[PDB]
Each structure stands twice: as structure tokens, then as C-alpha cells.
Amino acid sequence: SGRDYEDELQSERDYVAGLYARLDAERAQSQRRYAAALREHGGTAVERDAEVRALAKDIARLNVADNGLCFGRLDTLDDARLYIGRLGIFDRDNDFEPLLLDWRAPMARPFYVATAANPENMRRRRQFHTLGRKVVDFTDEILGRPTGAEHDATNDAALLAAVNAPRGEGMRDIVATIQAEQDQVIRLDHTGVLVIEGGPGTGKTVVALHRVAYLLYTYRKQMERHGVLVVGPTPAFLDHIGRVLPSLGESDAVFMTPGDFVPGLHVTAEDTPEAAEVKGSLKILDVLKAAVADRQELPSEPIPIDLSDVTMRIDAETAKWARDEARKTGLPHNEARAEFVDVVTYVVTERAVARIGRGWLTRDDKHAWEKMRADVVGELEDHEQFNAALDALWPILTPEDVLAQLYTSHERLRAAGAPECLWRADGEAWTVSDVPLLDELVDLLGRNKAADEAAERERREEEAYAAGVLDL
Amino acid sequence: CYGRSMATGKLVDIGEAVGIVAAQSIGEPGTQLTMRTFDIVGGLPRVQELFEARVPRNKAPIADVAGRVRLEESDKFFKITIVPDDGGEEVVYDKLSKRQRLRVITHEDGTEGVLSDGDHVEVGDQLMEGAADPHEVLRVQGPREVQIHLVKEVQEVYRAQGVSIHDKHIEVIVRQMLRRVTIIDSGSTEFLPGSLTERAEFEAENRRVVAEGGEPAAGRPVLMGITKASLATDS
Amino acid sequence: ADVLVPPQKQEILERHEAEADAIERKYQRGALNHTERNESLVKIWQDATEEVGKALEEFYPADNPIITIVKSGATGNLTQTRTLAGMKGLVTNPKGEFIPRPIKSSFREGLTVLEYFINTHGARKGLADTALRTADSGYLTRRLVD
Amino acid sequence: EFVSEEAGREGTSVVIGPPDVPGTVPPSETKGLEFDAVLVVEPERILAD
To answer: List the disulfide bonds (chain C).
Structure first.
């Protein structure tokens, strides 16, 4: 919190003010030429449209550029300032001397990829922490040996300078070794999985962030539309990261913890006890698959059908046959209800027409379509018992309820190869260890179609009744 | 109410078809307007976006209340909170993409610039640069102000592109776009709820009902488009 | 003869080609990308046309027929007058963007082969669009009438 | 004392301790951070936790 820092901060604020002034003026003249081209333009309709669109793109680019224009700055060894940003600003008067570089330039490269052991020609690197137009603070990152640097947000420079150790080989002049290690991590060409297992006191997190910057610049063309997912143990640490995170130009990060891997809910680390160590393990998959089969309950008592003449047709044979065939397609549970119903209805219509309707003495044009159709339909509409019966056998269910109907019953649990240390009173005191079991379950159960159709239908006729209902 | 016919230069006559006149006066210069690539370019697309009461792409939120603003901003987001002047409940607009910058005012004097904290806000005022949503205006401000806003926007579009259309044509069409009500509480009337009833029939029905005139029919206006409003016809 | 060419045109075009050279020097020096470059080139050869038209306005007498038919409000405008005695300037690609290589020749001097090739794009785009435009207008009118 | 003297400093000074004690946080929210001065109290309850 020195004074030289205030001097520098004010200087940089003045410079960015000048940049924003030029940006304001270019927006001004661009809106002016835009209005003009819109009114007359003199020329032809196609030239008019082209000029209109071009000036609109200029307006949009500048409008966006207003939000964090200058990322930072470079001081080279020949003492030539460079200012990096999301917009190129040149002076048309002094032969287009760069006042602000675009980060996508072959000359703003020693800002993502430069280290303290393999710099390019640089002596320093600054980052600026902006809100929308204001330079709150900045941090230097000297690419070499520091002595004391006013503000860094990690103080790395004053620690890298107070290294007091016995003379000798001395691990090759302590600083150089650290710098070369970091360089090896960052300038590495694997574009796959890297592990930086180090320890305390070595800056592994900052190194990882510089690594991510190097990668997101180098391969900014496969990424830049995907993101950077950064998980962590606590939102305090995540805000710390977000606060000393390099550019990631034109990309965006997504911060997370184990606990918010799910869309919507943010577990506050309830930390189910050590027996849940069997949840942080892949065997649990079986359990899920075995707890998602105990939901295909088999009828013990025969379910009564009352289609005005027909006897109860579904029973252990029918339900068993249908559950087996539904498990015999290799796809999720809520999409398998389809085959269950297809089979039950098949064997309750084709095998009830030739018995209860009248019987035999017609092999076509009555058995094939007519009684077929009547039985089919009378069954498809029985949303009271037939469908309640199915929902009793093949329930359309969801991840948020299986863990609850499993962690409590103590019988469904035993029917899943599951142990008994995972039983708890409340089935929705969701912990950290049962989050990945909710993301794994949406892929075993999947998503039906019928229910979604009916639901969006009702939703449509609910958004149409509130305002005016004539939709057709 | 119409005024003087522009052909005859005198007062309009009785039996003059003035809806077709407006239709044609708006259509004819349509080729003189910017178009879509075969909003950002506000030509025929914007006119189609208004006469059909469509939510815009660059929608801007308006003030449900008067009062002053507390402006917060974080990474890529604005959050405004309107502390009213009466002393009631403040409202908030939180997920405001900093892409849409703000509502610059450029006041007559002092060079206001952007909308800021501690500044004042009238009802129906716009906070973001862009294009308000007619239905919001309708519920907050009301039908008349809806109509006026729509005419202002259409004629802005045209003016910016060198076309002279007297606003009474826009007004005819708009009028026909806000010409109905959705009933809520039938009252003592021969009306169903959720139905679309023409405001004049509705007034005349809940007005002629004076016998036991202690609970008449209740209805709320609805903002339709020039294609639905042609489906919701009485013939 | 009545079609008169400003004499200042050459000074203008060379003064702007100087700045274009500067830009391309940057590009080859790495301080500039391949799109920002084209943006600057366009923003340069869009002003040269303004200056040529201004000169043309300040050089044509008033007894001239090509300026009389314009200033009388009879027909035309000064953009065509520039295109004819000045310079067609910039032209679009079939996409709809610009081409940083302008047309520094008029229809009086005579466009070269390439200039005459890259000026067919927008022309055909117009002759194509000019039915879809009518159709959109007619659709809006049909609605407004219904 | 630690707290109000560290206030006399210009660096973060978070304290760690078991959950029962008030005014001190567990050692599991400092998981991947750094501070300037740190005070840990009751090493053994947290060791055996």
C-alpha cells in the first residue's frame, strides 16, 4: 500500500481514460455514419445494407470492448511499452503506432506464453483488475529476478528475493531452478492430462493457472467455445482463483466444487461419514443398477382388469416376460417403460380378443384390426388402474428419489448388494458423496417422451390461458 | 378523431376506408428499408417485430415504479435496485448483461451521459439501451401508453430511413392491435372467462346491466399482433 | 469533356496509399491481425472517396449539366457523380463484407479487368434480392390489410 | 491478542481451530489458500478428529 503504487495506478488510469476516449469517439462517428447511411447513403440498396451491417458490427465490437478494455501491459528489455486489450487502437497520425494491442496479435504473445526462464524479449508483465471501466489494482510479474515489487496479490516477488541458503552448488542458484521447473510445466507440449503433484510453498496453483493461459492461447481455436472448468474445495478458494486468474481471452471459466456438479443445488459439505467411502468407488454402479431394478417390481397379487368383459390378464408370467424383454434392449429405465407397455398391451389384447370377445371363427379383418383396436384403445385410456398399475410396476422415477427410497427402506438396500452403513434417517440430507450418484442416475434412467409431451402441452395451455386462449 | 384527409386536404368524409389507406401508405415505402440477411438493423424486421407484439432480442427492462436507483455491477453483470419515493417495496433487475451497456440519456444540458446511481426514474422509463417489451409497458403503464410507445418506435424506424407517414395510420393499426379484453370474472353477464371479447361490446354489456348493477363483468386488456388480431375476428 | 476529373485525385490516392503501406508494414511486423488490418484499410479508403467527392464538388462549375441535373433536384446525386468522374471506391464481396482493395478508377478512366470483376458481386446480389424485398414488403402489407 | 496485533499488520491473519470453539474456523476451508500469519490452537483435538 505504498505511494509509488498510487503514482503508477493514476498514470495507468489516465492512459486507459485516453483509450476509452478514443473508443467513445469512434462509436460517435460510427453512429453518425450509420444514421447517414440509413437515411440516404446516395448509392444502391445492397451497398446500403453492407455499410449498415459493417457499422453495426463496429458499434457492437466497441460496445463490448467497453467492458475490460486493457488486460495488461508489457515492458520489454529495450523499454518499449505495450498495452494489451480486446481491441486494437492505433494512432493514424504517427504511422499507426500501437496504442493498444489486440491479444490475438503475433506481438502480444509474450503475455500468455512468456515465463521467467524462456521469455521472448520481456522484462515485466502487468495485469489490471477492472470492473467495467476502472482500473482497481494491478499486479506485476517480473520475468527474471525480483528485488521488491509494490503489489502482486501473491507477493511472489519479495519471497523469490529473500532466499538465504548456504553457498555452494546450492541447488544451482535456488531461483533459477524454480524458474526452470515452472517453465517446464508451462511450456510443455502434451495437450492431455498433466499432474503437478508438488507440495506446500511452491506456488503450484499459480503455475497451473499460467499453464491454462498458455493452453487457452495456443489452442484458442478448439477451445474458446468450450470453456475452462475449475473445480475446488471451497468458494473462498474459488474466488481467490477468479481474482488472480489470467486473461483466458474471449473465453470464460466455470467455477465449481464437489457438491455443485449438479445443475441447481449447492451442497454445503454435509460430508456423510467414512462408510460412504464405498460411494467414492465404482462398485457402487452395480448397486445403482441393482437399485434401479428393484423398482421394476413384480406383481405378487394379480392386478384386476375391468375392460368391461376381460379378466385380469397381467400376472407374474406377463410382468416377468415384459420386464425381461425390457431389460433385453440395452437402454435406460424411463425409456424402457415403452417396451414394458408395448408387451403388456400386446399380450393383453392379442391374447384377450381371441378368448373373451367371442373366440374363434374369424382369422382376418376382425381379429387383426377391429377387436385389436378396441382393446388397445380401451387400455391406453385407463389412466386410473392400468396406468396406476404400470406406475406401480415400472415407475417413472428420478434420481432425487431413488437415493431416498433406498437409503431408508433397508430392504430395497439389501436387494441391491448394498451394505448397511449407508442407511440414514432422512433420505434427502444430500451430502457430497451422493452428488455424483445423482449425475450417474440421469444416464441410467434417462428421460421419457410421453410425459414430456403432456407436460409441455399443459404448460403451453397454461401460458395461453393467462393471456388469451385460442391456440390451435 | 381521425382528422383531415391528406388527399382532399379537408376533413375526412363519412364512409372513407382509412385502414386500407394506412396499410398501403406503410407498405409502399417498404422496399426503401433495410431488411434481413438472405433488431440490430431496425428496418422491416423491427416493424414486423412491433405490429406482431413480439418480445425483442435486445429487450430492455423498464421501471415498474418511480424513485431513485442503487446501481451495483459485477463481472459481466449489472444489478439495479429502485428505491421508490412513496416508501414501499423496492424492485430489482439483477441479471443485466453488461453487453447492453446502459441507458445513456444525453440530457439537454450538463452532458448527463450514462444512467447512474442516485439518479431518478419515472415509471415506464428504460434502464438499458435497447427496446422495451410492449406487454411490460402494457401492465405497468397501460394501454394508451402502449399505443403511443408503439407509434413512437415505428415512426422512429421510418424517419431514420427517410419515409414520411403521418402517425394516424400507425394509430389505426395499433388501435386495432389493442382492441380486445380477456375476461376474468364474468360477473352477471353472458360471458365466459378466458374468452376474448371486443372492448366496446364489453363496455356496452357491463354498462346496460344496471339491474342489480353491483357486480359486473371484469376484464383485462391484452396486446395482440396483426395476425392473431385477424384470427380473433367476430365475423 | 463535360465529365471533368479533379486534378487533386492523384495526391489524395497517394497520400492514402502511404497509410496503407504503413498498415501493411505493421501487419508484417506482427502488431496487427489480418482482420483489424482490413478494417483499417477500409476506414482509410472510405475517406479518400469523401475527399474526392468534395474536390469534385469544389471543382465542377455550376453551369455544368452533370451538376445541374443533380443540384436542381431533377435526378441523381453526387455519389454517382463521384463514381463517374472520381472513383467507385470500395465494393462488396458476394458474402456482403468489403474488399480492402478499392477501385481507384472511374467509369470515365475505365475500370481494369479485376476491378470490373469484383464489381459484379454486389450487382448480381441486387438483381437477385430485388424480388425477395418486394415479397417481404407485400407480406407486411397483406397482414396490415387483413 | 494475536488478532488485534495482526490488525496492526497489513496481512491476512486467519485463525484455525476445532468447530466447538467460537471465532476460529476449521482447517478444511484453508484447504488451498495462503495467509500471512496463522495461529492454530488445540493441535490434538484436530489431530484426533
So the answer is: none
Answer yes or no: do D29 and A234 touch at CB < 8 A. yes
CB < 8 Å from B in window 84-123 of C: 96
CATH of the domain at C126: 1.10.132.30
Quickly tell me which residue has 496463522 as its cell: D38
Are residues A221 and A243 in contact, defined by beta-carbon separation less than 8 angstroms?
no
Rounded to whole angstroms, the Cα distance separating B133 from B149 reads 10
Alpha helices in chain B (DSSP H): 18-27, 44-51, 134-140, 143-159, 167-177, 199-208
User: For residue B197, what is the nearest residue in chain A, using CA coordinates?
Assistant: A468
Residues of chain A contacting residue B193, judged by C-beta atoms under 8 Å apart: none
Alpha helices in B84-197 (DSSP H): 134-140, 143-159, 167-177
Domain annotation covers residue C3: no
Structural domains in chain C (count) = 1
- Experimental technique used? cryo-EM
Q: Look at residue C137 and tell me if it is in a domain.
A: no
Residue to substitute from A32, A47, A55, interface C, most C β-carbons within 10 A:
A47
Using CB atoms, pick whichever of C133, C144, C146 lies closest to residue B27: C144
Q: Which chains touch B (3 or more CB pairs under 8 A)?
A: A, C
Domain range enclosing C46? 8-130
Inter-chain touch A234–D31, beta carbons under 8 Å: yes
A216 within 8 A of A242, measured Cβ to Cβ:
no
Bridge partners for B216 per DSSP: none
Q: Is residue C2 part of a domain?
A: no
Chain B CB contacts of C138 below 8 Å: 27
A196, with CB counted inside 10 A (0-12, 13-18, 19+), is: exposed
Give the span between the Cα atoms of B206 and B199, in whole angstroms.
Answer: 10
> Which residues of B fall in the annotated binding site for Zn(2+)?
1
Alpha carbon distance A439, A421 (integer Å)? 22
C37 assigned to some structural domain: yes
